């Protein structure tokens, strides 16, 4: 087997990456894309050494693989420790879609999320925001984008509290149950949310302003053809199946002023104007805002 | 020796599974039948290796078997990881039977669940939905079909919340008390439910629309001969014992318009009509809908 | 010597048992008596193996016994898995005794439960139902008969919920507080209940019909001599102790039509008549019904 | 060395005792004295074996000693299981002292409890019932006698329910919070209650008769001398000291009819007569009743 | 053989630290800056030893490094023991910023915390206070400044209890979950807090006075231009963002009397007056107070 | 071999200690000072053994050190068993201080605690009692004096329960998390408590008298000059500092009647008179009382 040459190559890779990491850890952690790439490369080298050890029974290969796993673990631990000491995080981009039941919010949100995660980085991931009745985050791995379906189904005050905690630039600790997950932090870039409620928070809620100002895009949706069909021919499934289109052109979307809390233009401070929009335009605006915030956080 | 022959066979099988996983993973997880076959093959190879190891004590044999077990576990973990990060799931098929007490709903539900599980896949398995007194999902193993009896017995609103959560195409994390089951999800293909309440949810409930649209087949059951005999010959066990047939002829079934909530054909949006049905026709329709949805999920 | 032949016999027993299990696991689990007998034989084998291992001291016997107990545990685990995969259980036989205070319902119920447990299976056990202030089932082990000493004392509607849950053929999950007890279900064959209330449920309760149909035998008890003795000469302990009898002749028993809720013969659907009865006749009838149900559940 | 010979001796005793447990499980679990002595000897043997193990240095003797320890552990577990499988328990002897404040019934109750505990078994323990504030029983240790001070106090419905639960011959399970405390029985033999209430339960309580029948000795206590001293010489400490006596002769006690609930001799069924008594007659009668019940249960 | 020479130098440094520690543990404990520098040097040396051990593979270097780290751990444990027995600590300096939402409290607080952490020590760190949903302090590493964002968002009274416990000179033990972190204490020097509430505690609170006196600098903030722009042009993101400045000139700050609880000058024991302040005046005053307290504690 | 001679001398000293303890178990277990001195001597022997092991590690020397540490462990286990088997242990002296907020109670309490610990024994330690947020005692080391601050801040009921449990003369077992700590006894001579609430318990507490009787010294504090200044100059911090003297002469201390619950002299048994006191006078009286209590416990 060509074990010696691959071992030498991975040795060179790990040593050069070790020195590179040791150089400027502070700027590296403030550079999100570079750090993510470095972690991915470390994982690739680790799994490659693991499989190389697995397929060979030579004790020398096993010892070398153990040494390389030791080195890679040390580097990953040092970088993770530097990242935990940070005192700020980027402010995530939050999109919240409100509309009647059965019109297509969930599948549109899935499309938006995948497009965004691809745009931020090739190989980006989508994660799940645990909902009420689950109080820990042990399924979380720090993905680029997060999905939150049925926000406000029941217990909307707790939904507001979670949203205020995570939609911010101040660091945050997350409750976990497993021993090795204690002391985890929320470091995702974007959040997409679907709800049936009339807004982010109730109009009599104490923290109305704090939660409303944290939503970057607040979209209100309808679908006239779906609703008309369901109204005139109840129980007919083929017609309704015909009312939906593969480019989401059945959804009619309006956008509210940044910081609003209903579909009439009211914000906690003044009155603005609603404006029509589509799903491509929303994707373009969201991508632009994400890149802008990323650049300004790098320059911070 | 036959032992080394079986060892070579299982080595070839694990090599085939490894190369299949390495080639493509997203297309494999998007193909539910192929992924399940993959899992079955890996489980059978693991069990055969374990029993063969137990039947002997040769150091070389145990070493080879432990290495093979490690490789099998690695492949299984990789597939599990790929499935955990899916952004969508197939929408389950949900049947809810309402009717007066004592007439035979639970038996019909078990018949339907067995046949459905076998038709979806040879060796289907049916599982249990925890009821309102149990708040954790330990004891769920990703079953093809799930059975849920006494829906709305005391706490119909928590049952409504649970049903809305699980019946969807949005991935979901379940609450479990063991550490090793932490952050697991719901991946079932159908749910069969029996009820004594007038419908899926109260007419004054807030999430009436969201809950009703998620019910695929709403069946209303009666049994006139049984009710007559237990009315005119109370306390007589034998006359009542004689009113049940081994093919469910005693049950008389009506089907409501998809999205309704009562006997008279009312829906949240319109006013449709009822339709007489039988248990076998209902089964054929459920199989047809399950196949349609599975093909669409594989394509999308 | 004795150890060699004993371990050879144990090996033969375990191998033939493994063959039988592999052959007809499903038949066994559907055949209650055979499954119970095989489980008891496995318990005997494990106990004998551990005793023999402890008695002697040398590597050969200890290693052989360890392997044997491991294989026995694997067989028991596979059988338990198959038993947990079932879609149905046998409907338990339920007896409820209602009468005025201080006449001897508890002693009679213990007599009945002991006789029933002995008849269902030589060496059967009797367990306890967590009454009302304990919400967990961590003492439950899967006994033949269950004893419910007070029912409806302080919260009768919660008692009705629990009785509806456990008196069924649908598989059930039990709430437990220990880690190793998570995902436990109810498999007992008979339930004897003593009460101080008018009937199984309040007359205006909402689930009267569901809970009253599930009581096989509803007995109303009295003791005219005891009541006369304590009404004419209050405070006399000697006369009271004189009143009772070792053969339970002091109790007079009436039987209501099945599905009734009071002692006037009323049922939720009709109106029957009351019958006289005794403890021995009750025991004979209950054994007959239990064997009938066991045979019919097995023959499927 | 000598460690051989001694081992033989001690181990023989172990197995010897095992024999008298194997053939007499019913008797040992029936009578508390024999089982208590058996446990005492078993733990003495375990301590002796630990001492020998720490003293000894031969691998063979420590192997034998740990084998003996395992044998002791399994025997103790068997005894515990047989005890936990009981379908009945001995009925407690319950004394209730009804009297106004500032007469000295708490010290009298402690004296009675101590003498009873010594009589029932030498060097017995005395425990405290949870004080209507903790709903769990974590401190409980199965004491011979239980003392309940200030029964009632505006929370007498819950106290009535608790007394009905514990004063019985049916097995009971207690609510706890610790993992190892789950599923705990009740095993005490006598209860002494002191209260200011006018009886065991309110005259309108639903469970009046059931609660009244379980009280063995209901004694109404009065101290005319102390109340006279308070009337004549308020704030006089020397007179306060003078009124009390070391022999409790200052307490005037009326014994109520068996099963009564009032100081006028009223009973839920008839009318009786109050009698005069004292501390020593009460203690003698309690001891006699306890011995009667204990032997009756032992032979059954 | 430079590795041996550097290892000998490290050993000499370890011996120097060992002899230094024995000088006076009590005074070194009293001197916080010296203790922090000593621990920093110790951990840096140990990390260097471990890294150079990882670089090499010969037994000699690893053995020498194990001995050196054993000495290092001995010293670290001795100093930890000395530091754990103290009966007093120093009072942290507490800054609390109160103002309307969205004006820049969190970013100003981050600025202040960074500057103050560097001012206290060259290279000091900032850490995160656990919030109401997280229950354990496993992310705490004894950092020199602490951040607390969103104080009193949901449960203000629990926040008051926590702040009263941590702002004090009495030693405090912190709840945690990992075993090795059982029994660690709070040792930070400064705390920076932001809130939307109108003061440290609600006026009707039982512990108003105890909590108010523990806050050293209470600042009330307002940004009139930001409020004007967001009121006149609701939804104009660029116009609003043009109002924020890199020198925090947009935010106007008034300092309240030591011990006050609102912005009208009121104190629990009287009424004072408000004064104007800025970022740099706050920073200089906080540094002066911190240095004063550190010196006074040193002398004590 | 000087190492062998030193090890033999240490072993002979250990054996002498064992024989002295065995022949004088009662005195060692009773006299607190004797037990502390014995523990310190054993700790010194352990330190010498560890130093000897560092000096040499020959296999014979290793075995000798193993035997020495085994002897020391035997001594520790014997002492622990004797103390656990002890019927009772000396009860501590409680000094509770109450007063307005921010007058200097914590610093005075620390001063008094240090002085007491030094008086009772040279090099006497001081410990911190866990507060409400912590429920485990893993940081307890059997200190001479315990210090408790902010008693009754949030959990006055649970604080009262802990005060009743802790001052009792019966043996008490402490909760702990780590496996070794499990089985931890409480042994300490004095408890100094600083409070903001009036009196040890509220006037309506059912166990008011029982918890008051556990308090030996009850001090009420007032600092009239500090209060007047902070009333007249709310914001002047230097003026506030001017009022505190390094001899604690700014405090005014009153002492309440034995058993009292408030500062007006009222007692459960009547009423009394307050007295002036000072910190040194209180210290001398407390030392006298603790010495008398220890003497009477030892003499028996
Ligand atoms: N783009 C689409 N292509 C095909 N079918 C669609 C599409 N969008 C919606 N549907 C159909 O409409 C159903 C509604 O799906 P969802 O997107 O979950 O609706 P919804 O708006 O989330 O409803 P709520 O508010 O959660 S009750 C789907 O299950 C499909 O049957
Ligand atoms: N197909 C059948 N064959 C034989 N007996 C039957 C059949 N269906 C019902 N029964 C009998 O009728 C009883 C009715 O029980 P279930 O089937 O559980 O009725 P149900 O509709 O679930 O009533 P509820 O709503 O749960 S009270 C059964 O327990 C059997 O004794
Ligand atoms: N078979 C019997 N032999 C001897 N004494 C008996 C017998 N049956 C009842 N007794 C006596 O009568 C009492 C009645 O006790 P229980 O059996 O508990 O009566 P009960 O019907 O359960 O009353 P409730 O409803 O539980 S308050 C017993 O405690 C005995 O003293
Ligand atoms: N025989 C006695 N010997 C010595 N002191 C006694 C005696 N009887 C009463 N006393 C005193 O009387 C006091 C009254 O206290 P308790 O005995 O608790 O009164 P009590 O009857 O319990 O009041 P209640 O009903 O619980 S409020 C005791 O604390 C003793 O000091
Ligand atoms: N100094 C600044 N430099 C640049 N942008 C700023 C600055 N201050 C505020 N902003 C912007 O305004 C937003 C206000 O954020 P925060 O500082 O978190 O406000 P806030 O005072 O904490 O509001 P609350 O109380 O948390 S609702 C920031 O997220 C930035 O987008
Ligand atoms: N002897 C002293 N010398 C110097 N400053 C003192 C002295 N006593 C008190 N002070 C100051 O006054 C403050 C009062 O704090 P504490 O000693 O904690 O008072 P306190 O009695 O504990 O108040 P509470 O009840 O905890 S709110 C201290 O933090 C010091 O700043
Ligand atoms: Mg949706
Ligand atoms: Mg049913
Ligand atoms: Mg009873
Ligand atoms: Mg009393
Ligand atoms: Mg903020
Ligand atoms: Mg204080």
CSV table of C-alpha atoms in Angstrom, one decimal, chain E residues 32-252:
chain,number,residue,atom,x,y,z
E,32,UNK,CA,-4.2,39.1,42.9
E,33,UNK,CA,-2.1,40.4,40.1
E,34,UNK,CA,0.9,38.4,41.1
E,35,UNK,CA,-1.2,35.3,41.5
E,36,UNK,CA,-2.7,35.7,38.0
E,37,UNK,CA,0.7,36.2,36.5
E,38,UNK,CA,2.1,33.2,38.3
E,39,UNK,CA,-0.7,31.0,37.1
E,40,UNK,CA,-0.3,32.3,33.5
E,41,UNK,CA,3.4,31.5,33.5
E,42,UNK,CA,2.8,28.1,35.0
E,43,UNK,CA,0.2,27.1,32.5
E,44,UNK,CA,2.2,28.5,29.6
E,45,UNK,CA,5.2,26.4,30.7
E,46,UNK,CA,3.1,23.3,31.0
E,47,UNK,CA,1.6,23.8,27.6
E,48,UNK,CA,5.1,24.3,26.1
E,49,UNK,CA,6.3,21.1,27.8
E,50,UNK,CA,3.3,19.1,26.4
E,51,UNK,CA,3.7,20.6,22.9
E,52,UNK,CA,7.4,19.7,22.8
E,53,UNK,CA,6.5,16.2,24.1
E,54,UNK,CA,4.1,15.9,21.2
E,55,UNK,CA,6.7,16.9,18.7
E,56,UNK,CA,9.1,14.2,19.9
E,57,UNK,CA,8.5,10.5,20.5
E,58,UNK,CA,11.5,9.2,22.4
E,59,UNK,CA,10.8,7.8,26.0
E,60,UNK,CA,13.2,10.2,27.7
E,61,UNK,CA,11.5,13.5,26.7
E,62,UNK,CA,8.0,12.2,27.5
E,63,UNK,CA,9.2,10.9,30.9
E,64,UNK,CA,11.0,14.2,31.8
E,65,UNK,CA,7.9,16.1,30.7
E,66,UNK,CA,5.6,13.9,32.8
E,67,UNK,CA,7.7,14.5,35.9
E,68,UNK,CA,7.8,18.3,35.1
E,69,UNK,CA,4.0,18.4,34.7
E,70,UNK,CA,3.6,16.5,38.0
E,71,UNK,CA,5.6,19.2,39.7
E,72,UNK,CA,3.6,21.9,37.9
E,73,UNK,CA,0.3,20.2,38.9
E,74,UNK,CA,1.5,20.0,42.5
E,75,UNK,CA,2.2,23.7,42.5
E,76,UNK,CA,-1.1,24.5,40.8
E,77,UNK,CA,-3.0,22.4,43.3
E,78,UNK,CA,-1.2,24.0,46.3
E,79,UNK,CA,-2.1,27.5,45.0
E,80,UNK,CA,-5.7,26.5,44.4
E,81,UNK,CA,-6.0,25.2,47.9
E,82,UNK,CA,-4.6,28.4,49.3
E,83,UNK,CA,-7.0,30.5,47.2
E,84,UNK,CA,-10.0,28.4,48.1
E,85,UNK,CA,-9.8,29.0,51.9
E,86,UNK,CA,-10.1,32.8,51.8
E,87,UNK,CA,-12.8,34.4,53.9
E,88,UNK,CA,-13.2,37.5,51.8
E,89,UNK,CA,-12.8,38.6,48.2
E,90,UNK,CA,-12.9,42.0,46.6
E,91,UNK,CA,-16.1,43.8,45.6
E,92,UNK,CA,-16.6,43.9,41.8
E,93,UNK,CA,-17.2,47.2,40.2
E,94,UNK,CA,-20.7,47.2,38.7
E,95,UNK,CA,-21.8,49.4,35.8
E,96,UNK,CA,-25.5,49.2,34.7
E,97,UNK,CA,-26.8,51.0,31.6
E,98,UNK,CA,-30.6,51.7,31.2
E,99,UNK,CA,-32.2,53.1,28.1
E,100,UNK,CA,-34.7,52.7,25.3
E,101,UNK,CA,-34.4,50.0,22.8
E,102,UNK,CA,-32.1,50.0,19.7
E,103,UNK,CA,-29.9,53.0,20.8
E,104,UNK,CA,-26.6,51.2,21.2
E,105,UNK,CA,-26.3,50.1,24.8
E,106,UNK,CA,-24.8,46.7,23.9
E,107,UNK,CA,-22.1,48.0,21.7
E,108,UNK,CA,-21.1,50.7,24.1
E,109,UNK,CA,-20.9,48.1,26.9
E,110,UNK,CA,-18.7,45.9,24.7
E,111,UNK,CA,-16.4,48.9,24.2
E,112,UNK,CA,-16.2,49.6,27.9
E,113,UNK,CA,-15.6,46.0,28.9
E,114,UNK,CA,-12.7,45.6,26.5
E,115,UNK,CA,-11.0,48.8,27.6
E,116,UNK,CA,-11.5,48.0,31.3
E,117,UNK,CA,-10.3,44.4,30.9
E,118,UNK,CA,-7.1,45.6,29.2
E,119,UNK,CA,-6.7,48.4,31.8
E,120,UNK,CA,-6.8,46.0,34.8
E,121,UNK,CA,-4.2,43.7,33.4
E,122,UNK,CA,-2.2,43.4,30.1
E,123,UNK,CA,-4.2,40.8,28.2
E,124,UNK,CA,-7.1,40.2,30.5
E,125,UNK,CA,-10.3,38.6,29.2
E,126,UNK,CA,-14.0,39.1,29.2
E,127,UNK,CA,-16.5,36.4,30.1
E,128,UNK,CA,-20.3,35.8,29.8
E,129,UNK,CA,-22.7,35.6,32.7
E,130,UNK,CA,-25.2,32.7,32.5
E,131,UNK,CA,-28.7,33.9,31.8
E,132,UNK,CA,-32.1,32.8,33.2
E,133,UNK,CA,-32.5,29.8,30.8
E,134,UNK,CA,-29.0,28.4,31.6
E,135,UNK,CA,-28.5,27.0,35.1
E,136,UNK,CA,-24.8,26.2,35.5
E,137,UNK,CA,-21.5,28.1,35.3
E,138,UNK,CA,-19.5,25.7,33.2
E,139,UNK,CA,-18.4,28.4,30.7
E,140,UNK,CA,-16.8,30.4,33.5
E,141,UNK,CA,-12.9,30.5,33.6
E,142,UNK,CA,-12.3,33.1,36.3
E,143,UNK,CA,-12.3,36.0,33.8
E,144,UNK,CA,-11.6,39.6,35.0
E,145,UNK,CA,-14.6,41.3,33.5
E,146,UNK,CA,-18.1,39.9,33.0
E,147,UNK,CA,-20.9,40.9,30.5
E,148,UNK,CA,-24.6,40.7,31.3
E,149,UNK,CA,-26.9,41.6,28.4
E,150,UNK,CA,-30.7,41.7,28.7
E,151,UNK,CA,-30.9,42.0,32.4
E,152,UNK,CA,-34.5,41.4,33.6
E,153,UNK,CA,-35.9,40.4,30.3
E,154,UNK,CA,-38.3,37.8,31.7
E,155,UNK,CA,-37.8,37.1,35.4
E,156,UNK,CA,-36.3,40.2,37.1
E,157,UNK,CA,-36.5,38.9,40.7
E,158,UNK,CA,-34.3,35.9,39.9
E,159,UNK,CA,-31.9,38.4,38.2
E,160,UNK,CA,-31.9,40.5,41.4
E,161,UNK,CA,-31.1,37.4,43.5
E,162,UNK,CA,-28.2,36.5,41.3
E,163,UNK,CA,-26.8,40.0,41.3
E,164,UNK,CA,-27.1,40.3,45.0
E,165,UNK,CA,-25.2,37.0,45.4
E,166,UNK,CA,-22.3,37.8,43.0
E,167,UNK,CA,-21.8,41.5,43.9
E,168,UNK,CA,-20.3,41.1,47.3
E,169,UNK,CA,-17.1,40.4,49.3
E,170,UNK,CA,-18.4,37.2,50.9
E,171,UNK,CA,-17.2,34.0,49.1
E,172,UNK,CA,-19.7,32.2,46.9
E,173,UNK,CA,-19.8,28.7,45.4
E,174,UNK,CA,-21.3,28.3,41.9
E,175,UNK,CA,-23.6,25.5,40.7
E,176,UNK,CA,-22.2,23.4,37.8
E,177,UNK,CA,-22.7,20.0,36.1
E,178,UNK,CA,-19.4,18.6,35.1
E,179,UNK,CA,-17.8,16.6,37.9
E,180,UNK,CA,-14.4,18.3,37.9
E,181,UNK,CA,-16.2,21.7,38.2
E,182,UNK,CA,-17.9,20.8,41.5
E,183,UNK,CA,-17.2,23.5,44.0
E,184,UNK,CA,-15.7,26.5,42.1
E,185,UNK,CA,-16.3,30.1,43.2
E,186,UNK,CA,-16.8,33.6,41.7
E,187,UNK,CA,-13.6,35.7,41.5
E,188,UNK,CA,-14.2,38.4,38.9
E,189,UNK,CA,-13.3,42.1,39.3
E,190,UNK,CA,-16.0,44.0,37.2
E,191,UNK,CA,-19.5,43.5,35.8
E,192,UNK,CA,-21.1,45.4,32.9
E,193,UNK,CA,-24.9,45.1,32.5
E,194,UNK,CA,-27.4,46.4,30.0
E,195,UNK,CA,-31.2,46.5,30.5
E,196,UNK,CA,-34.5,47.9,29.2
E,197,UNK,CA,-36.0,48.0,32.7
E,198,UNK,CA,-36.4,51.4,34.6
E,199,UNK,CA,-33.9,50.4,37.3
E,200,UNK,CA,-32.0,47.7,39.2
E,201,UNK,CA,-35.0,46.3,41.0
E,202,UNK,CA,-38.8,47.0,41.0
E,203,UNK,CA,-39.7,49.6,43.6
E,204,UNK,CA,-42.1,47.4,45.5
E,205,UNK,CA,-39.4,44.7,45.8
E,206,UNK,CA,-38.6,43.3,49.2
E,207,UNK,CA,-34.8,43.6,48.6
E,208,UNK,CA,-34.7,47.0,46.9
E,209,UNK,CA,-32.1,48.5,49.2
E,210,UNK,CA,-29.8,45.5,49.4
E,211,UNK,CA,-29.5,45.4,45.6
E,212,UNK,CA,-29.3,49.1,44.8
E,213,UNK,CA,-26.3,49.7,47.1
E,214,UNK,CA,-24.3,47.0,45.2
E,215,UNK,CA,-24.4,49.0,41.9
E,216,UNK,CA,-21.5,51.4,41.7
E,217,UNK,CA,-22.2,53.3,38.5
E,218,UNK,CA,-25.9,53.6,37.3
E,219,UNK,CA,-26.1,55.3,33.9
E,220,UNK,CA,-29.3,56.4,32.0
E,221,UNK,CA,-28.9,56.8,28.3
E,222,UNK,CA,-30.8,58.5,25.5
E,223,UNK,CA,-30.1,59.1,21.8
E,224,UNK,CA,-32.4,61.9,20.6
E,225,UNK,CA,-31.3,61.9,16.9
E,226,UNK,CA,-31.8,58.2,16.5
E,227,UNK,CA,-35.3,58.4,18.0
E,228,UNK,CA,-36.2,61.4,15.8
E,229,UNK,CA,-34.9,59.7,12.6
E,230,UNK,CA,-36.7,56.4,13.2
E,231,UNK,CA,-39.9,58.3,14.1
E,232,UNK,CA,-39.9,60.6,11.0
E,233,UNK,CA,-38.7,58.0,8.5
E,234,UNK,CA,-40.0,54.5,9.6
E,235,UNK,CA,-38.3,51.8,7.5
E,236,UNK,CA,-35.4,53.9,6.2
E,237,UNK,CA,-32.4,51.7,7.1
E,238,UNK,CA,-29.6,53.8,5.5
E,239,UNK,CA,-30.8,57.1,7.0
E,240,UNK,CA,-31.0,55.6,10.4
E,241,UNK,CA,-27.6,53.9,10.1
E,242,UNK,CA,-26.1,57.2,9.2
E,243,UNK,CA,-26.8,58.5,12.8
E,244,UNK,CA,-24.4,56.1,14.6
E,245,UNK,CA,-20.8,57.3,15.1
E,246,UNK,CA,-17.5,55.5,15.9
E,247,UNK,CA,-16.9,57.6,19.0
E,248,UNK,CA,-20.4,57.0,20.6
E,249,UNK,CA,-21.2,60.7,20.3
E,250,UNK,CA,-24.8,59.8,19.5
E,251,UNK,CA,-25.5,58.5,23.0
E,252,UNK,CA,-26.1,61.0,25.9
